[PDB]
Amino acid sequence: PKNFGLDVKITGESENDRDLGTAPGGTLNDIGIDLRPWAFGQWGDWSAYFMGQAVAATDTIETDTLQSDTPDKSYLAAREFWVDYAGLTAYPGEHLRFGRQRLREDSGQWQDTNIEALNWSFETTLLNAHAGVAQRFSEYRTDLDELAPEDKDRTHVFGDISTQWAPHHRIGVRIHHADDSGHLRRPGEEVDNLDKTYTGQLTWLGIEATGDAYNYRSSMPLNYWASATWLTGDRDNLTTTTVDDRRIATGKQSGDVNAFGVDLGLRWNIDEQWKAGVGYARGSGGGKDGEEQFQQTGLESNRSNFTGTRSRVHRFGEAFRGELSNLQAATLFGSWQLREDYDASLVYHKFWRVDDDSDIGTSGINAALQPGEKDIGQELDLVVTKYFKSALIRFRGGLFKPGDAYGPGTDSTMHRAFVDFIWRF
Ligand SMILES: CCCCCCC/C=C/CCCCCC(=O)OC[C@@H](O)CO
Ligand SMILES: CCCCCCC/C=C\CCCCCC(=O)OC[C@@H](O)CO
Ligand SMILES: CCCCCCC/C=C\CCCCCC(=O)OC[C@@H](O)CO
Ligand SMILES: CCCCCCC/C=C\CCCCCC(=O)OC[C@@H](O)CO
Ligand SMILES: CCCCCCC/C=C\CCCCCC(=O)OC[C@H](O)CO
Ligand SMILES: CCCCCCCCCCCC[N+](C)(C)[O-]
Ligand SMILES: CCCCCCCCCCCC[N+](C)(C)[O-]
Ligand SMILES: CCCCCCCCCCCC[N+](C)(C)[O-]
Ligand SMILES: CCCCCCCCCCCC[N+](C)(C)[O-]
Ligand SMILES: CCCCCCCCCCCC[N+](C)(C)[O-]
Ligand SMILES: [Ca+2]
């Protein structure tokens, strides 16, 4: 029985320009402290949990590798607050959770965030199923009084069902729906940064096959992941006049969304220390008003253990932070690990634009794209970790080289590096 605990973290973030010299800001070389006290109790079928956050930094630096963690120098936050009930069935892996909680999916491409949700979890040796509802109402932070433009009035409903057909081999289907209840800006009106750009309903229907894809300790000399997703729905996009400094609303446009996302990967377990492999991912692009343009839920971190280590790496570069939106990416990787002691991960990515006249999903780059050019760029990552006997010291960095899609006047190279010192009580 463990009731209280505290997580002390010391983050060192260094990021360079983001907009690659096209706008003011995006540069960081700052240090910060993160104290996360957590409470927990359990009474029969019931259990309750709370986690707070206290952050004091030299600037607005990132303190965790989550979607809710993508403002003033210091802030207090209500990280997690939930009540759980495991008395619905006689199943040990079955439980219903209500409140702000972490929604986790192993690929991190669907859900990996702390959000207000009612999530029903069912886990057995043979079958795993999860069904829930989620919506953002507040950031529960002292420095933020307004939600993200995309999170405001966005209601989610998700379902997972997967079976272990062969030992270490899982096949499953996934469903997600995001409904936008928002209000768009009127022609003469002003459109802000925290102001909405789109409305409409989007349904995701995916199929995923795994053979110890995110399991660092496997008997199998080869590991794989294969995921195919079909995005269907409609959208109400606010057109703008970006040329004027204020960027006024003007009109809007409608278009049905019919897109598709694919993600393949192969890992080679050379021995119990050395691992390597290839990855490929494509998010459909083009069509009128982004008709064939794929997009993700908005609850994704795109972080996983695809490299074959305890450490979680960003699937589409730590610096570029790729999203499967009009994006095609080739991936090479290599990892090393000693005992429960150390681990390293070296990853290389080459990015492409599916449609040369439309935008790409980038969670780390804020630069305009050159029309008619598909070469986004190439990235190299390094994740190094030492574990303490229970903290860890970790370097997590990416080095992005902007290609032909980012015209002259943009930086030759950009980075995003982190040094994290955690100590859990
Ligand atoms: C273009 C689509 C063609 C449809 C065929 C799909 C075939 C996909 C194969 C994926 C790699 C092989 C997986 C092998 C595997 O799961 O091991 C079976 C083993 O565990 C049984 O004991
Ligand atoms: C939307 C639901 C939110 C629920 C709030 C989360 C609950 C807050 C803290 C979790 C720890 C349980 C606190 C209850 C308590 O103090 O009972 C005493 C007992 O735990 C002694 O250890
Ligand atoms: C006791 C366990 C609670 C589960 C209750 C069952 C909830 C109903 C359906 C579960 C499917 C997952 C939800 C996803 C969904 O249906 O939305 C997609 C739908 O809008 C397609 O247009
Ligand atoms: C063997 C190479 C492994 C790759 C290491 C990845 C580390 C990523 C970024 C390092 C940040 C420190 C700045 C280093 C530097 O001087 O880069 C110059 C220029 O590219 C700035 O973006
Ligand atoms: C910015 C700090 C983040 C980096 C973590 C520090 C890890 C340092 C070196 C990793 C390379 C592995 C060498 C250590 C090793 O395995 O041999 C020594 C002993 O076996 C363990 O003490
Ligand atoms: C390699 C990644 C490590 C990031 C580097 C962190 C440097 C600490 C910056 C503190 C100095 C900033 N200042 C002047 C505002 O205090
Ligand atoms: C060197 C700083 C001391 C480390 C302690 C970190 C906790 C900082 C709490 C900040 C909360 C204040 N705030 C933002 C609500 O006004
Ligand atoms: C360490 C946890 C401390 C408790 C939670 C503090 C967060 C309060 C959120 C309300 C902040 C007020 N505001 C400015 C957003 O309106
Ligand atoms: C990518 C390989 C495709 C394999 C398809 C799965 C066939 C296994 C037969 C289903 C039986 C499932 N089970 C274990 C619940 O009985
Ligand atoms: C990034 C490319 C993928 C790495 C491929 C892994 C290399 C295969 C292992 C060759 C080792 C030879 N051996 C021991 C089997 O004889
Ligand atoms: Ca800049």
Curated annotation (Swiss-Prot):
Question: Short name of one Pfam family for this protein?
Answer: Alginate_exp
The biological pathway it contributes to is: Glycan biosynthesis; alginate biosynthesis
Q: List the membrane topology term(s).
A: Peripheral membrane protein
Region (Disordered), start-end ranges: 281-305
List the protein's name: Alginate production protein AlgE
Keyword Amino-acid biosynthesis, does the record have it? no
What is this protein's function? Has non-porin-like, channel-forming properties and probably functions as an alginate permeability pore.
UniProt keyword annotation of DNA repair present: no
**GO BP of this protein:** alginic acid biosynthetic process
Name a single GO cellular component: cell outer membrane
The protein's location, in the record's own words, is: Cell outer membrane
Q: Where is the composition biased (Polar residues)?
A: 293-305
